[PDB]
Design a protein around this ligand. Sequence first.
Ligand SMILES: O=C(NO)[C@@H](O)[C@H](O)[C@H](O)COP(=O)(O)O
Ligand SMILES: O=C(NO)[C@@H](O)[C@H](O)[C@H](O)COP(=O)(O)O
Ligand SMILES: [Zn+2]
Ligand SMILES: [Zn+2]
Lengths: 188, 188
Amino acid sequence: MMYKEPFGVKVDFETGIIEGAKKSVRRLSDMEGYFVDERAWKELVEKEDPVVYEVYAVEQEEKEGDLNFATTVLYPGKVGKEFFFTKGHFHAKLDRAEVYVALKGKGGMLLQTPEGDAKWISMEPGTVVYVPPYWAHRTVNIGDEPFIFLAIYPADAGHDYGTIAEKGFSKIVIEENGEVKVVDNPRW
Amino acid sequence: MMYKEPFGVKVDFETGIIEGAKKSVRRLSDMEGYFVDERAWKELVEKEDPVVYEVYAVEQEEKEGDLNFATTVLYPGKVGKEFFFTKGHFHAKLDRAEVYVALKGKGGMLLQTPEGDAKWISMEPGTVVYVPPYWAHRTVNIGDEPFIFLAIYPADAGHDYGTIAEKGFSKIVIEENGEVKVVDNPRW
Ligand SMILES: O=C(NO)[C@@H](O)[C@H](O)[C@H](O)COP(=O)(O)O
Ligand SMILES: O=C(NO)[C@@H](O)[C@H](O)[C@H](O)COP(=O)(O)O
Ligand SMILES: [Zn+2]
Ligand SMILES: [Zn+2]
């Protein structure tokens, strides 16, 4: 039988750039219906339309046992009080776990179950996050520099964005009274 | 609707230590039949018996789609001309892939197919190695300081050490004339 070729790729923990990877870019305009403050979103899109995050994904065929890996560069910023975040998703195969290795910056992960059980995990360089089966996950940049991390996930996990896209997470991550706060989403 | 708890753990990139992890120690005396120079192995065991490597593992139950992670501290040394290495294994579920992230030191990975064809991947801090389905894998420390890396692998992958314990890899990594060389294993 044919065996796939092993490879190494150098990843600058300062940039998150992977050569040979599929690069995807999310601007604020790619994120309509995601942030609580809709008027703040609209204004920011018209003034700047900032890049919220970039992903460098090295992806295999959707086979059991195989592994994908991707870095994310999550840029600093706010939409009103709400910190820049990733869209967030469940996996297409719900019971697929994931491992995150925080590389640069200050951020965290919001995770929630299909029942809306909600978890916040602080992330700083060296933080490894176990994302268990069934937990949807969004990363958040709570600092003023790029938040960079590596994600390793089953090649057959898939990305399920729909239910998060309409309903969001049960918690939001805001700056209020000079504090980073994880509070109940009002639109939830 | 029981779900497992998400968590974050600090991995120290300088030392490899994961506080709370399952720590494993492998001494040279636990590696009979692994190095070409058996007399050199015997002597180094009788006089010192160094730790060759340590593993800090965060493991889940053996379920499909779940993920384990572990750091290895592979200490610097030689047995005769042959650099210290990990025992090396195939996965019990052969088609399970793996992703390594090099954190500190100077090393590399020896990989081989069930047919004994071998590959070498140099690893320096920042190197991410994709270990494809079906490839056995051994890491080697080619420098004078600890070689430290993080591995992420399917939780149902398992470890099979059998044929490697008997026959090793078809290639060896040695120092010869002040130079690191990947050469054919004379035993093969
Ligand atoms: O969790 C991952 N992979 O499965 C990550 O690689 C995410 O896919 C990545 O950070 C981008 O975020 P969204 O996919 O939520 O837009
Ligand atoms: O590949 C891994 N996990 O599957 C690694 O975590 C290895 O198990 C670890 O580096 C120790 O090497 P041996 O298992 O060959 O002694
Ligand atoms: Zn995911
Ligand atoms: Zn392995």
